[PDB]
């Protein structure tokens, strides 16, 4: 298979600045015809793609001049002169020269904002679902940014792996923070064998974790 | 206008056989040098090209998956299927009857795009979710943060709303998951410390094909 790996995977720009984003091949994406096969698509939330861009730098009807692509060979570039608003979206490059025909994983043009610390809220099982012998901790880290964080689960100051299911929402439209939400859903009978619960969230706002706890008996 | 048009079960169980249809306007599967693709996204995926048909019935198809698919075409009608056999929870996603010709006239590139039909590959039958409420730990700080959790559902969607909607900023409600099999929700909702429990609050889930409807109240510990 032709490897499409786009840098970088997320994009933070201001409305106005220039942005580039490089698609590089595992292979030529030469076709033995003579033409390079490497097309730029743009995937705005819940829109099917559109083409912008086919063999390496013709624009495609009615895509403003604003949008550039480049390259060469292995080596792929799509370029925005200056980003508007509308442009936000995730872009992939694509090579149609070999089989299986394939896509690059995508790359997020975010808008940068400030950086912002999570709120770390935690729950515990609640007793509607005690009742009736399951049992989930939930962990909010709202308003964050960058999306970046790391989150551990601890049972007793001992780290849980299994068990543990994720959300993130998209970036805001009105304040650009992200936020997740995580929860360990253990047995009802694995939750009253033990007794301390951490959700730690490691962000680069800060040098420490931010933790958040509770033990089961005081509740 | 050159419309293409998707048209599938939305909902089957694991084993079974997909059957897709693409209807197609304002051009034919007829010229020389013209072609009709599948691609296909999970939700929060990237794409993924399936199957490629053209105008003298030669098909390109993605090698993982071969032996599950087969495309083909009826040109009168302005139609193209794709079958994929054996399908699995992996095969939940998105699928675009897409435009491709092998000619530069015509279109050497996906121009043409369908809307997309979603299918859910799934074993599970309806079920009802159960919506439990998050009351904060056992104060002293400017804002407190409720939750609610809706756990075990299926199909999708539920909507959940804090206070029957009179409730509508602080709110975060995070994409459904997968846990089985059925889909988990849940949704924060952050107020000021003065507000609750003084002025109450409560999630309001409904989840509409299992005639759900549960309003579950944050109760301070």
């Known amino acids: 298979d032709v490897l499409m790996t786009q840098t970088p995977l997320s994009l933070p720009v201001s409305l106005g600045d220039q942005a580039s984003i490089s698609c590089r091949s595992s292979?030529?994406?030469?076709?033995?015809?003579?033409?390079?096969?490497l097309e730029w698509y743009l995937q705005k939330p819940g829109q099917s793609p559109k083409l912008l861009i086919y063999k390496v730098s013709n624009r495609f009807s009615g895509v403003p001049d604003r949008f550039s692509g480049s390259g060469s060979g292995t080596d792929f570039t799509l370029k925005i002169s200056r980003v508007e608003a509308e442009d936000l979206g995730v872009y992939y490059c694509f090579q149609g020269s070999h089989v299986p025909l394939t896509f690059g994983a995508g790359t997020k043009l975010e808008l940068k904002r400030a950086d912002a610390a999570p709120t770390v809220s935690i729950f515990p099982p609640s007793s509607e679902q005690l009742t009736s012998g399951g049992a989930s901790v939930v962990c909010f880290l709202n308003n964050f940014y960058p999306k970046d964080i790391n989150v551990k689960w601890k049972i007793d100051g001992s780290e849980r792996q299994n068990g543990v299911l994720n959300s993130w929402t998209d970036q805001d439209s009105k304040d650009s923070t992200y936020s997740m939400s995580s929860t360990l859903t253990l047995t009802k009978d694995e939750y009253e064998r033990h007794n301390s619960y951490t959700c730690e969230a490691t962000h680069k706002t800060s040098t420490s974790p931010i933790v958040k706890s509770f033990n089961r008996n005081e509740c | 206008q050159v419309t293409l048009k998707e048209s599938g079960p939305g909902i089957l169980k694991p084993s079974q056989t997909l059957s897709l249809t693409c209807s197609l306007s304002?051009?034919?599967?007829?010229?020389?040098?013209?072609?009709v693709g599948w691609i296909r996204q999970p939700s929060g995926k990237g794409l993924e090209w399936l199957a490629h048909i053209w105008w003298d019935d030669d098909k390109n198809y993605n090698p993982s998956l071969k032996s599950q698919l087969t495309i083909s075409k009826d040109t009168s009608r302005n139609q193209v299927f794709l079958k994929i056999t054996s399908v699995d929870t992996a095969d939940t996603a998105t699928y675009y009857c897409v435009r491709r010709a092998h000619n530069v006239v015509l279109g050497d590139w996906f121009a043409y795009w369908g809307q997309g039909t979603l299918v859910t590959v799934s074993a599970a039958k309806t079920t009802a979710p159960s919506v439990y409420p998050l009351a904060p730990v056992c104060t002293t700080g400017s804002s407190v943060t409720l939750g609610c959790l809706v756990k075990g559902y299926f199909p999708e969607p539920v909507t959940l709303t804090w206070n029957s909607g009179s409730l509508s900023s602080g709110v975060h409600t995070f994409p459904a998951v997968l846990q089985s099999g059925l889909y988990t929700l849940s949704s924060s909702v952050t107020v000021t410390s003065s507000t609750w429990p003084s002025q109450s609050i409560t999630c309001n889930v409904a989840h509409p094909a299992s005639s759900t409807k549960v309003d579950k109240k944050i109760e301070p510990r």
């Open positions: 292979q030529s994406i030469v076709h033995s015809n003579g033409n390079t096969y």
């Open positions: 304002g051009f034919s599967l007829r010229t020389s040098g013209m072609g």
